[PDB]
Amino acid sequence: LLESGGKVTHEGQSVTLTCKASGFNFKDYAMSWHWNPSGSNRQFVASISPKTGSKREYKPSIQGRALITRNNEANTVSLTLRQLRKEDSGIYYCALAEQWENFGPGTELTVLPLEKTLLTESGGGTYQAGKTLSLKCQTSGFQFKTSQLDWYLWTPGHAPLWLTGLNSSSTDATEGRITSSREDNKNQIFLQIEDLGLRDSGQYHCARRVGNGDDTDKLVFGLGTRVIVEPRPAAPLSPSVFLVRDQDAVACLIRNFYPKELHVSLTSGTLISAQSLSLAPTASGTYSAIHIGRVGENDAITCSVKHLGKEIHMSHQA
């Protein structure tokens, strides 16, 4: 009459309680599980005839989620409880309705309330390099102080990346361009990125680690909040225009212009039907651009660039 199991788990997860017996004909006697909520209410909850499960009457209050099985090879009698609930807390004993009064030393099953993980990030937008970015994450539905919370960066075409996180006995407060803090009273966590770089753009994601506590665990992510970085606002610079033709395909290379509200167009006075502009900032703090189209190896072309204040053309002949 020695049972095992009775761990601590939450009200969604299953459990398997086992019970081992020695010293008598285990194969020949019937076996039952009983239950006392915290004690003093020992009620027959499961009955099986170890001969085999010919008579198995486990349906007082746990019907549908109780499965008692007897092996007898390891002398095991299990009661698997598949969908536990708040009131399943109690002492589970091992022992038309056959009389059972030789009870054993019941194990205790403690079941905890449900945890929903609500992570709400906020504080994104568009920012200028060098400026200091502070991001908030509201965390509701779980015990905060003993959670494990981490920030992740999701950049399109880039692998998601871990930024900074914290444990229960964290006491760390990492310094650097990546800063994480937590307010225990408001149940909030915070990210801080000073001197925002360009590769620092993307969607920032609060994340909670959940699971058994091992490599099986997973990351619950919030909706995230998006962050764009745009060049440090510099004095106006006017673009340097060049034309590069190659076998019926011309490109107009424009560079070093802030702001980038220019209207670049490839045209001898004839507007090209195939032409597209691609604007991208460089590592200097100003935008460059390329407006690309097609014009044959014989034909001659022109490019016009109306960056505010000036207007630069470059033409190439036949």
Binding site: A159, V244, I292
Partner: protein, 219 residues
């Protein structure tokens, strides 16, 4: 000596077929590969996790073996597949493979494979590059050159590009991917100083049609 995850740049399949999203692991000991999905608008969730040793799968809330299956490719070794069966358009999105690293305190994700579900059959056309070298006028005027690459006429609208002379890729500017229907394109330019102009640099690019290994262009 950190753990890396190589994934194909994308996977497109006709609706109703299967989808093998591959993931090659490098320097991992964690015995557990996870699969995460990011669907535009929804928070990213884990679909499931597979054991490198036993093969057992653990699905997450509302996911199951009817739509997802994770295994380890017997071919090439240490390759792992997430097989999405009976594709729909809600199945579209980003599929990452992930692991725990650095004593289990950080999670490492792959670059991501974008699953795109076409409503009918599709032409899987590959990209065609054209290269413009820096001109004598641009080296005279700006004491630097600009290598302009236009990748044109590829499907699907997904491609990765970079430049490497050095092992770390060189910092370029990348244009918005522009196009529609069954033709998309992207331009990428690399402004290199007048000193490194003589160095033989190499331009690398990856697209679904060229498999997993990249394509290279010298000079």
């Amino acid at each position: 000596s950190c753990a890396h995850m190589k994934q194909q740049v994308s996977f497109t399949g006709i609706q109703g077929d299967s989808a093998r999203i591959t993931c090659q692991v490098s320097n991992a000991v964690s015995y557990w590969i996870h699969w995460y999905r990011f669907q535009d608008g929804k928070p990213p969730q884990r679909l499931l996790c597979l054991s490198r040793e036993s093969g057992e799968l653990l699905f997450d809330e509302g996911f199951g073996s009817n739509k997802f299956h994770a295994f380890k490719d017997q071919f090439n070794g240490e390759k792992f597949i997430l097989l999405i069966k009976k594709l729909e358009v809600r199945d579209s999105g980003m599929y990452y493979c992930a692991i725990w690293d650095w004593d289990g305190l950080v999670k490492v994700f792959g670059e991501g494979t974008r699953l795109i579900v076409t409503e009918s059959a599709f032409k899987k056309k590959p990209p065609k590059p054209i290269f413009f070298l820096p001109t004598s006028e641009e080296i005279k005027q700006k004491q630097s050159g600009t290598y302009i690459c236009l990748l044109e006429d590829f499907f699907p609208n997904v491609v990765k590009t970079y430049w490497k002379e050095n092992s770390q890729p060189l910092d370029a500017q990348f244009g918005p991917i522009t196009g529609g229907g069954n033709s998309y394109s992207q331009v990428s330019w690399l402004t290199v100083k007048e000193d490194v102009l003589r160095k033989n640099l190499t331009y690398f690019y990856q697209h679904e049609d060229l498999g997993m290994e990249p394509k290279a262009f010298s000079i």
